[PDB]
Amino acid sequence: MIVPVRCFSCGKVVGDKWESYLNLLQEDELDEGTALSRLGLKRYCCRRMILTHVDLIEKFLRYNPLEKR
């Protein structure tokens, strides 16, 4: 849904890295491994949190009951 603020296994804060990860994938032609490395995620426990996030809140947000559609 929304990016987990802290990695489950260790506790390194990965919640502030989702947008920068998307930028590194979009602007630069960096693959996921290189982008995760550059973001500072060393342990694979930290790498999986940002590598496998789905970000379903974007799909959840289109059903807004407080706005005229």
Binding site: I2, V3, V5, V13, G15, D16, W18, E19, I57, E58, L61, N64, L66, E67
Partner: peptide
């Protein structure tokens, strides 16, 4: 850290 997202 991205705490939440919103819509109008």
């Amino acid at each position: 850290i991205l705490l939440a997202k919103l819509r109008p």
